[PDB]
């Protein structure tokens, strides 16, 4: 005969007081199973008595950790002390129903006057908690803040990530998405620089003729203003751009003096210089991405970084998808990702897969294994030079 | 939805009191038809599938208002036989199935507690309070209501037990801990008015465990000092205040809150020659705090709030009024 029963849920645990308990002898009957199924014949069995939510997601994580380990938590002991009538089993006990037998034993050793019944051992409390877990979305809804799906989602992620220690050594998503950003804005930079190159050489073609390096082009067009305001070594700029006094500045000024491009309007020059500022901002952000990505590559997978080099190694990582896929791939599938070229290519694929599995299955990887492998590659390079 | 049947039971329960009101000359038959129709509509809405605590509350308000109007008509017609017994019984029935249908609505729980405390059911009130605390443990307002009405009754042990279970549960916001310290020092005050407690060490104990509770902060200690500084007319109040300010000095050496309590420390029992001497003392402490190395913006905002309180107090000197206006203006 049951009196109260605990029920631990994701948002928190609640204890119900049973009224008009179920028959334990005819428990395998279609009528009592139908009554357990429907809701209008189970709310007569179960009446809600006490609820306790978690205070914070860290506290709920602590709840799952202690409960799955079997040890009751202190605030669960507090809530049971609040709800159960105070007694020791000298003359009158209280029957509780819980799911885990170890939790039953611990609650019994905490409160002497509470005899627990385990869902593992007693079919009546088994069927009772089964009905409650089935209709759990309706019984709590009068005080259920929100719904239960998102809480179960987040609580399961918190518990499993705490058991795995996942975010300490998962960073491959940052690596691959950085690579995709890098080559995306590299293409965008190339296209925008070509655009401003044509779009300003319409006004001044000798600058196109004499200055390559479209980033330096964007810099010098942000610098030059209009075709009519030229002096060679004005302030702080051309000597750190390029050679200053005797190589290019006089050439540019002379090309402007002989130049026959169209005059440009003020607002058109403003728009051109805004586009050039845009291009140089993306180029500066590119070099920032490259530096931070080299450092992150050295932190994540250093053996690949020293064998292949960061750009192509991260291309391989990006194409495989993650370090786990890269390591799970054998050598020849990694090859899919004369005769000397084929020989050194298969050899390099083998050493690449070795570096991948090392740098993935370490916790915090090291560098000297990749240094030893690169030394072996250089020695095979000398071996093929012997030919 | 057998709500026709359930409403039939409740109206057949309500019928004989209406027969009493008809055999007496208190309500006439047209009024009684209006009453039974309104009660039928209310009971059907209450037992309907889609219901709301506002609907239960409006039915409660109607039944209670009918009880009041019946009392007025009875006292006008000079009768004494008709009582409020059936009316309070049916109101209790409405509230009981109200909290059954919607247990998680603290609005309805508080209205039910208000009804019990109004019509004089103290034991019933303790039972209702226990059930509502079991359904809403994290309600600082409910815990304070339980503890404060128990201390108003005089059950210091029961008001204790309520507050101790409350601060065992509600550990996130310090409001309940402030309320327990408030009630404990009110008990010390009631004992001093009646004239261990000679020490008065229970608020110090509450402070020592509040230091390790996870709400423990500078502003939390500031609230503690505020509720300690109210009603300073006591015996060991200076001992308590000194322990609080020494603990805050030992923990947060340069927090603007700690400087604020060092500012307002010697103003415990001031209202009169004892007032302006402590005023000058705290003015020196305030100027030292304003010139010392502390977050001057936060400290001065605390101080101008404090001086807003001071200027809200009246019956002061014009000279000190003008110098407080100047010191507040220089911030």
């Amino acid at each position: 005969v049951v009196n109260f029963l605990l029920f631990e849920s994701a948002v928190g645990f609640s204890l119900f007081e049973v009224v008009h308990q179920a028959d334990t002898v005819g428990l395998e009957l279609p009528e009592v199973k139908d009554a357990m199924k429907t809701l209008d014949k189970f709310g007569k069995m179960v009446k809600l008595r006490s609820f306790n939510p978690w205070t914070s997601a860290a506290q709920g994580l602590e709840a799952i950790n202690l409960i799955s380990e079997g040890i009751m938590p202190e605030y669960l002991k507090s809530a049971l002390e609040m709800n159960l009538p105070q007694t020791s089993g000298k003359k009158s006990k209280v029957v509780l129903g819980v799911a885990d037998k170890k939790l039953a034993g611990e609650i019994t050793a905490a409160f002497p006057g509470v005899q627990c019944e385990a869902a593992d051992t007693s079919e009546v409390v088994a069927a009772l908690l089964r009905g409650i877990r089935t209709h759990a979305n309706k019984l709590h809804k009068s005080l259920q803040e929100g719904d239960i799906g998102r809480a179960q989602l987040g609580l399961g992620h918190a518990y499993s990530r705490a058991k795995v220690k996942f975010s300490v050594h998962k960073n491959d998503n940052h690596i691959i998405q950085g690579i995709a950003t890098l080559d995306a804005l590299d293409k965008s930079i190339n296209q925008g620089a070509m655009r401003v190159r044509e779009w300003y050489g319409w006004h001044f073609p000798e600058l196109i003729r004499i200055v390559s390096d479209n980033i330096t082009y964007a810099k010098v067009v942000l610098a030059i203003g209009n075709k009519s305001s030229l002096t060679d070594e004005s302030v702080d700029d051309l000597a750190n751009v390029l050679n200053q006094d005797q190589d290019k500045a006089l050439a540019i000024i002379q090309a402007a003096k002989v130049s026959m491009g169209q005059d440009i309007s003020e607002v058109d020059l403003q728009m051109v210089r805004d586009l050039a500022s845009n291009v140089t901002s993306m180029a500066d952000y590119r070099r920032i991405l490259a530096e931070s990505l080299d450092k992150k590559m050295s932190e994540v997978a250093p053996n690949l970084q020293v064998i292949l080099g960061t750009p192509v190694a991260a291309r391989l990582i990006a194409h495989a998808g993650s370090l786990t896929n890269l390591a799970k791939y054998p050598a020849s599938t990694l090859q899919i990702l004369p005769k000397v070229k084929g020989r050194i290519s298969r050899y390099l694929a083998n050493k690449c897969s070795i570096a991948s599995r090392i740098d993935n299955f370490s916790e915090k990887p090291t560098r000297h294994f990749g240094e030893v492998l690169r030394q072996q590659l250089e020695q095979r390079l000398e071996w093929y030079a012997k030919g | 939805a057998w709500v026709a049947d359930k409403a039939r039971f409740y109206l057949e329960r309500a019928a004989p009191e209406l027969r009493e009101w008809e055999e007496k000359e208190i309500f006439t038959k047209d009024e009684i038809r209006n009453l039974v129709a309104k009660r039928s509509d209310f009971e059907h809405l209450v037992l309907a599938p889609g219901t709301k605590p506002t609907d239960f509350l409006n039915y409660v308000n109607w039944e209670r208002s009918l009880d009041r109007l019946r009392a007025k008509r009875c006292a006008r017609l000079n009768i004494r036989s008709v009582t409020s017994h059936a009316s309070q019984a049916r109101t209790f029935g409405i509230f009981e199935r109200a909290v059954l249908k919607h247990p998680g609505s603290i609005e309805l729980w508080l209205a039910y507690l208000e009804f019990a405390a109004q019509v004089k059911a103290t034991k019933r009130w303790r039972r209702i309070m226990t059930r509502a605390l079991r359904l809403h443990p994290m309600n600082a307002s409910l815990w304070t209501l339980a503890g404060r009405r128990a201390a108003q009754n005089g059950d210091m042990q029961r008001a204790r037990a309520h507050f101790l279970r409350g601060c065992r549960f509600c550990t996130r916001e310090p409001t309940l801990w402030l309320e327990y310290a408030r009630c404990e020092m009110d008990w010390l005050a009631r004992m001093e008015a009646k004239k261990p407690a000679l020490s008065g060490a229970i608020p110090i104990a509450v402070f020592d465990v509040a230091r390790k509770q996870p709400f423990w902060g500078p502003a939390a200690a500031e609230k503690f000092f505020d509720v300690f500084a109210k009603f300073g007319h006591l015996s060991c109040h200076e001992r308590i205040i000194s322990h609080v300010v020494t603990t805050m000095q030992e923990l947060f050496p340069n927090h603007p809150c700690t400087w604020s309590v060092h500012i307002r420390q010697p103003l415990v029992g001031v209202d009169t020659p004892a007032f302006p001497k402590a005023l000058r003392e705290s003015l020196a402490r305030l100027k030292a705090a304003l010139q010392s190395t502390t977050d001057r913006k936060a400290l001065a905002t605390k101080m101008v709030a404090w001086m807003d309180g001071i200027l809200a107090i009246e019956k002061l000197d014009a000279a000190i009024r003008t110098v407080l206006e100047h010191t507040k203006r220089s911030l």
Binding site: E74, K77, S78, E81, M82, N83, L84, P85, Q86 | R126, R127, T130, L133, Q157, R158, R160, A161, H162, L164, R165, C167, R168, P196, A197, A201, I202, A205, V206, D208, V209
Partner: peptide
């Protein structure tokens, strides 16, 4: 009778707050 909340004893004291409160109430 789980009707109301009964006052604490040393048997049913959970936290350090309740332990010290009962210590002080004993030493009074």
């Amino acid at each position: 009778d789980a009707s109301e909340l009964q006052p604490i004893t040393q048997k049913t004291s959970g936290t350090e707050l309740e332990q010290t409160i009962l210590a002080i109430m004993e030493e009074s």
